[PDB]
Design a protein around this ligand. Sequence first.
Ligand SMILES: Nc1ncnc2c1ncn2[C@@H]1O[C@H](COP(=O)(O)OP(=O)(O)O)[C@@H](O)[C@H]1O
Ligand SMILES: Nc1ncnc2c1ncn2[C@@H]1O[C@H](COP(=O)(O)OP(=O)(O)O)[C@@H](O)[C@H]1O
Ligand SMILES: [Mg+2]
Ligand SMILES: [Mg+2]
Lengths: 118, 160, 74, 371, 371
Amino acid sequence: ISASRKLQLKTLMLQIAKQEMEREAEERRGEKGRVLRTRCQPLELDGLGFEELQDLCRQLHARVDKVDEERYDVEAKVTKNITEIADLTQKIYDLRGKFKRPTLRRVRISADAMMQAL
Amino acid sequence: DDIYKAAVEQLTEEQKNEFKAAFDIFVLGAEDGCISTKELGKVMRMLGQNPTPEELQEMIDEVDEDGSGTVDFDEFLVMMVRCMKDDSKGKSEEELSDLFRMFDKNADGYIDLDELKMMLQATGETITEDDIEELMKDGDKNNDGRIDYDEFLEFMKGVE
Amino acid sequence: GKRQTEREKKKKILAERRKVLAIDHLNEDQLREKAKELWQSIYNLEAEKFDLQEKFKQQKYEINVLRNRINDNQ
Amino acid sequence: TTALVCDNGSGLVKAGFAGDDAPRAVFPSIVGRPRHQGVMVGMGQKDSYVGDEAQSKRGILTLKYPIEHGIITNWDDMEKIWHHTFYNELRVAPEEHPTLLTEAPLNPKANREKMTQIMFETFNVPAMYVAIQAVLSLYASGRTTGIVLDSGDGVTHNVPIYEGYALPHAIMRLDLAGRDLTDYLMKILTERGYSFVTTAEREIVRDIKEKLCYVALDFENEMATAASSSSLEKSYELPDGQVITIGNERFRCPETLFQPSFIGMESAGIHETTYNSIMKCDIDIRKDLYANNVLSGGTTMYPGIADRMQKEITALAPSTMKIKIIAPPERKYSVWIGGSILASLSTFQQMWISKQEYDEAGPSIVHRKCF
Amino acid sequence: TTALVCDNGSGLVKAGFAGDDAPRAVFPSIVGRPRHQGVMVGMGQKDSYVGDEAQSKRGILTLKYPIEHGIITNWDDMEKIWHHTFYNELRVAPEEHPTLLTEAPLNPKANREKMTQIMFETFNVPAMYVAIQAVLSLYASGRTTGIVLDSGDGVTHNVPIYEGYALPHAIMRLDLAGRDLTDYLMKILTERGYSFVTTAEREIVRDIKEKLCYVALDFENEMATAASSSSLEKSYELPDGQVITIGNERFRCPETLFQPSFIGMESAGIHETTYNSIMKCDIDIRKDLYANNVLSGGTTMYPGIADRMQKEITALAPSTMKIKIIAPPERKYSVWIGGSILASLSTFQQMWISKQEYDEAGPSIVHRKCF
Ligand SMILES: Nc1ncnc2c1ncn2[C@@H]1O[C@H](COP(=O)(O)OP(=O)(O)O)[C@@H](O)[C@H]1O
Ligand SMILES: Nc1ncnc2c1ncn2[C@@H]1O[C@H](COP(=O)(O)OP(=O)(O)O)[C@@H](O)[C@H]1O
Ligand SMILES: [Mg+2]
Ligand SMILES: [Mg+2]
């Protein structure tokens, strides 16, 4: 049974996972930008009458309201999720502490110090 | 490898003098300067803290890769400071969680033999048939046929 | 208790969320400028909402992970 | 700061700072006034030698334990013992350290209240907490269930615990312990000619019991073997010569634990009070208690007790259940190790009886929520 | 999206997504607070273990079912059970899934209205629908006629249906069910010496009933045989050993179904309330109901009931009609399978009680057209 080679494999897979996470985040950013360009259409309104200005403005206001509504919904969702994450993280930490802290101590800190003092 | 050469390079003569004082009993004379690892068992016990005998043999056989059976003072230095804690902080817990999430690309919350197999195959590293089963024991700590969060965390415990 | 409490809360949030809406009654150039500004505002809103979706997805995966771990205790 | 994990016990006081592996100072709890007249002038003769000092001058003292059976019968001597423990064996003033005493189950209330009143008025500690001696021994084993038999030197008690929920109706406290075994050994040694009477010679008989006695796996076979051969007779050298030879007194002294009829006690042995304590528990946690029987306390250090007890319980218990007896090598200090672990916990840090709370409710605070 | 087919039941909560074959998570519906004191600190002890977790720690809990006879008597506990079912056994937030509860016939209105109010206010589902537990069991059999006897654990009800037209004047609901059989078995076991009293030991008696009891084809002959030979005495090992031997208690416990005078109930057995339910129907659909008698529910899983019931009905019914008793092997989950089938239908997709409708008419919407 080799252990140093296992350590090499561990560190190398750690590096590979780091690189994969980097490239995956990069792809995520690219897809986010692409989808953002896809969904929010750009509009050009040069040399237009004021009536078209009113129409575009009102549509934009309605879209603003809708987007803020969706942001409110997803924000409530995220707040609830974060609350659950904090609670469950605390619970799992308590479980781990129960399992492990009974095994933490300072062994032989001064026991070996008693040689010939008596 | 020479990674721990750099690791031991951090400590200057301040610990070198103490190490030479400890090693002077190792060089007790009547020797041709070979300096084997015979006393190393108690040399690592010079201050009391001594690791597993298996780790002691791993350190012994690991260094002196030429097989000369000669203990370089640099080799003894790095092996005795290896008794001292030496780690690169083992990444980050959030970072490790992201790493396991990437590992759990199946989003199942578990990694089987195939998941880890593909994970390391993507690295391209040669892995023996004598391995894999070793990795099976290392990962499947619960003997449940999968790799869990605690099992992964122990598997990646402070490794960098 | 979410029968009027949550509904009125979000209604108030939307009401305060809306800012002034008095624009097209001005000269064309600045109106066009501000309309472009508000398009960019909506664009950033959509980008941030997508970011919120992705963060919510990741946090839901993490909540699945925490549920899985707490189930792994048994 | 660090907490002081004291453990009064009865026979050996064990103390030390929280978070270590072993108690810092372990010494007998005896206070012995001199009894003769004394003719040398200026020798610097004190009026009472306590602790380990009175185990070296015991030739001219009258040692008397201040704790009879868990309860404390002589409060002045106990105060003297505590003062010695704090100032000379640890050398830490109590004004800057929380304390965690230990107490046997089912003890009189007045004992506990007086203990807390002393700790708060005389020594003036910042905060003290009293814990049952068996829960700590369960901490030290790293378990969370199990029925622990803590056979100390004063009193033997048997507290069953499941999933952290103690069962108060199933505690079986029996007053046979190491001291009664010492007295019975001193009483059966007279059958060969050796008479120990003085309170100082009780210590010699205790040393004989510790070094020679063992628990027989089967009593009748050992009684028959010791009566025919002579392979058991082990000799021992008194503090002045004149070696003595102990025959079948070796396994007859600790046999009293499993047959308390020897010293005239009515109750059943420690092999049957554990089974009775289990049977009082609910029907669904009996398997776990059977599998996690824990031994602790000094008197459970006899060579060969973890097999005799398992054989007896297996005889009593149903044939299907597995009987396992946990006997860690660090049995003697198990209670104190558990006390250190408990005092080192972060969750426990707000359970101490703070001094302002005592000032508001008096010594009767200990029976209240802060248990 | 997919619909959540929950089925509260009384004794086992069965849930799962619509369109599958079997419920995803099946677990007892019990909520048990701990009853002892608890001495270990930081053990992470919760205040109420629900579902299948409280069937493993039942040694130190006091389990109490939140549903007595179909009706719900303790709304807080039922809310806790639902919350557990949604979040931990299925892990799907209810904000994005329709729900299809089930309810026994002839239940109090307030129960149903409170159920819908909870589902719409606390869990905030998009739309929920309440269905009678017998129509689903008729769905699962793939029939469209037939009289279904759904002998659950809370209440036994007998709904006849023809060509899809339910007959509301012929529903015979009887409150004898599995729980009363458990209590009667626990009461007749005392005739041999075995006493089960604690609410935790009721689970052990339930296991005995499930694994050993069977319905006798002829009662008097079995009573005579069990009193002479000993070929019936089957033994069973308690959770701690001490095997027990059940004699003629085997077929006397489930015989209460056909003679409710055993537990003091006046009414007639399940063999005669079916015939009475048929005879209340019109004279021209009695042949079809005779030929398509359906069994469902857990308690109809006793070995040998599909023959005893057929013999009894053949004795009661006219000699010309053919009596057939449909007893599918998937009896226990028949109601839930039918619920999945009903929720998967396209024609049913517009019968849900949409949330805006509830906002306009209040909880009393359930009694209205959306039944
Ligand atoms: N190695 C041993 N073998 C046999 N008996 C022992 C041994 N060590 C201690 N004892 C007995 O146990 C007693 C000490 O018990 P201890 O656990 O210190 O009591 P306490 O619970 O009061 O601390 C002594 O009086 C002695 O009789
Ligand atoms: N295999 C079986 N044999 C005999 N009785 C059973 C069996 N399985 C379940 N039961 C009885 O049926 C009950 C479960 O009935 P169930 O159909 O789950 O009720 P519900 O209609 O509330 O879901 C249990 O309490 C048990 O007493
Ligand atoms: Mg003790
Ligand atoms: Mg049912």
